[PDB]
Amino acid sequence: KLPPGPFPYPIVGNMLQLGAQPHETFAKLSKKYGPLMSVHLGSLYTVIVSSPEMAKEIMLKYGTVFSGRTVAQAVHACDHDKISMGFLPIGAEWRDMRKICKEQMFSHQSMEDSQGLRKQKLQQLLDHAHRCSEQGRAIDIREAAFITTLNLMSATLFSMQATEFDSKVTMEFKEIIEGVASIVGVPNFADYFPILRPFDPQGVKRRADVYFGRLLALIEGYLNDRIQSRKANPDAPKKDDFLETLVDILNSNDNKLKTDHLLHLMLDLFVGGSETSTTEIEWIMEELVAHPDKMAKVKAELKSVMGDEKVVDESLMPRLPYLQAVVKESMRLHPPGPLLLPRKAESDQVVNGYLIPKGTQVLINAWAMGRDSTIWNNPDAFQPERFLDNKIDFKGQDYELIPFGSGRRVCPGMPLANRMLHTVTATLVHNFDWKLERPDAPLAEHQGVLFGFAVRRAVPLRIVPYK
Ligand code: HEM
């Protein structure tokens, strides 16, 4: 009674038929089997959903049913799978971490207060960007967008006041994320073949506990050191960051959260906003460089609003209606997560007549719906003009665009993502002219796909500022 899919082979099921870079294969197989597919990844049953109306059935109509999360083995490291807001069933401790996220830390009231903590972090990059232009060196966009992202998240969370782009604090964080991504970003057969779960054959759960213990040790030091600063100054001026808010929650003791609940929350906030922004800023700074007709419309717009100001204030978003679309088009073409984050059917539920069993990992292919010929016309072409004078937005209600998810577990970092994805892009676009470090380059590198935590270019984007 389940959705249609290819013949499950013994044991392996449909885990050899995927080929390399599965996101496209889960898309092409949908043209024969349908929007609701059934792929037997080993023992892990999985339903692929690749159409807006079906994503509406999954995330909204039956959303409270499909509101779980498939948990990976690396997530059990340091008991993260039982503390994190990302991978907990919708419950008492999760509702608190949402109402805390959306209403206090990610509402506009806190975004506008954290506006000044992040401009300094763009200036450090813009000054470093000018460093590579004088001697005429090339800038690794991924490297530059990662360190800037950590400096951006660390300022929003901790209010670190370093004077160096590659500060000592930031590079301790950079290794651990890249170490975690190198762990989760590769397949762990314990997830698909449960008899291997006790053994942990590839040693994934262990190696994750090492880096998780480090990333949580550095977060602890930033908590206990603030408590003493909170004790020394009783009328301490409210820091306009996320950590100060979190300290002000367990001192009032209104909600029902522990201390480890907050530590692991800052981890998810830190990790969740780093490698996503890092990849999803490499794309626009490639799309605009690969299609110079469109960068020209962005620059001429930016010069119309900036004036002589050389850093983009996140409050000038409404006056950049084209950069809003340029990101929107990058959301459609190259979504950061090709299959988003796995959902789980917490109850036997029927969708479109087919039965979806309990514990069915529902992957919402956002890559296909970005290149589905039935939705966007000429989908394989970059064109931010299709979003001009269009209310289609990635807020979750336009299932034609689901890069940030929708339903009950929508991305809580959306207001912080777009203010980042726009400013750190509009600061490199408005200030310099870019050209590929290698114009005689294989197009396999351009729009290349790397399956892992997020899909990114096959080769890190390396361009030069020559103005
Ligand atoms: C920059 C682009 C980003 C993308 C494309 C992205 C993507 C996603 C997706 C697809 C989901 C799951 C949605 C669903 O299952 O329906 C999610 C959830 C989540 N994201 Fe992001 N994210 C981004 C940035 C961020 C940022 C900046 C933060 C934190 C500051 C963050 C933290 C989280 C957390 C904690 C969750 C768990 C939500 C829950 O389980 O209720 N992400 N994200």
Q: What is the DSSP string of 344-383?
A: E-SS-EEETTEEE-TT-EEEE-TTTTTS-TTTSSSTTS--
Query: Does residue 273 have its Cβ closer than 6 Å to ligand 1?
Result: yes
Question: What does the block give as tokens for 253?
Answer: 């003791």
Sort residue 124 into left (φ over 0), alpha (ψ -120 to 50) or beta.
alpha
Say how many C-beta atoms besides its own lie within 10 A of residue 64's C-beta: 12
Amino acid at 93: E
Calculate how far, in angstroms, residue 266's C-alpha sits from the geometric centre of ligand 1: 13
395 contacts 404 by C-beta, under 8 angstroms: yes
Torsion sign (Cα): 114, 330, 86, 80: negative
Calculate how far, in angstroms, residue 413's C-alpha sits from the geometric centre of ligand 1: 6
Beta pairing partners, 44: 41
Calculate how far, in angstroms, residue 119's C-alpha sits from the geometric centre of ligand 1: 23
Instruction: For strands 44-49 and 361-364, give the pairing.
Output: parallel
Q: How many folded domains does the chain comprise?
A: 1
Question: What does the block give as tokens for 168?
Answer: 């000592």
How many CA within 13 A on the CB side of residue 412?
A: 24
Range of the domain at 339: 1-467
The single residue listed with the structure tokens 């506008």 is: 112
Q: Which residues does a chain break follow in the chain (C to N more than 2.5 Å)?
A: none
- Kindly give the interhelix angle for 242-250 and 260-282, rounded to the nearest 10 degrees: 160
CA angle centred on 63, ends 267 and 450, rounded to 5° = 50
Query: Does residue 396 have its Cβ closer than 6 Å to ligand 1?
Result: no
| Ligand 1 nearest-atom number relative to CA 153 | 30
- Residue 56 phi/psi, 5-degree rounding, is -70, -40
Amino acid at 113: D
Query: Does residue 190 have its Cβ closer than 6 Å to ligand 1?
Result: no
465 contacts 433 by C-beta, under 8 angstroms: yes
Both ends of the chain: CA-CA distance in Å? 62
Cα 178 to Cα 174: distance, rounded to the nearest angstrom: 6
Nearest by Cα to 326 from 230, 224, 429, 219: 429
Cα 75 to Cα 78: distance, rounded to the nearest angstrom: 8
Chain Cα centroid distance, residue 4:
30
Cα 367 to Cα 417: distance, rounded to the nearest angstrom: 19
Question: What does the block give as tokens for 383?
Answer: 């064109």
Chain Cα centroid distance, residue 256:
27
The single residue listed with the structure tokens 């729009």 is: 447
Nearest by Cα to 271 from 30, 62, 457, 85: 85
Torsion sign (Cα): 240, 241, 243, 246: positive
Query: Does residue 42 have its Cβ closer than 6 Å to ligand 1?
Result: no
Cα 467 to Cα 276: distance, rounded to the nearest angstrom: 29
Beta pairing partners, 5: none
Instruction: For strands 343-344 and 361-364, give the pairing.
Output: antiparallel
SS3 241: coil
411 is in an annotated binding site: yes
Which residue CA neighbors atom 6 of ligand 1 most closely?
A: 404
DSSP class of residue 85?
A: S
How many CA within 13 A on the CB side of residue 375?
A: 21
412 contacts 108 by C-beta, under 8 angstroms: no
Question: What does the block give as tokens for 245?
Answer: 């808010």
What are the C-alpha distances in Å from 380 to residues 186, 234, 401, 447? 27, 58, 15, 11
E strand intervals along 218-328:
none
Calculate how far, in angstroms, residue 74's C-alpha sits from the geometric centre of ligand 1: 18
Resolution reached, in Å? 3.7
The single residue listed with the structure tokens 């057969």 is: 189
322 contacts 48 by C-beta, under 8 angstroms: no
Contacts of residue 175, defined as CB under 8 A and 6 or more positions apart, other chains included, come to none
SS3 343: strand
The b-or-e profile of 5-17 (16+ CB within 10 A means b, else e) is beeeeeeebbbeb
Question: What does the block give as tokens for 122?
Answer: 């763009």
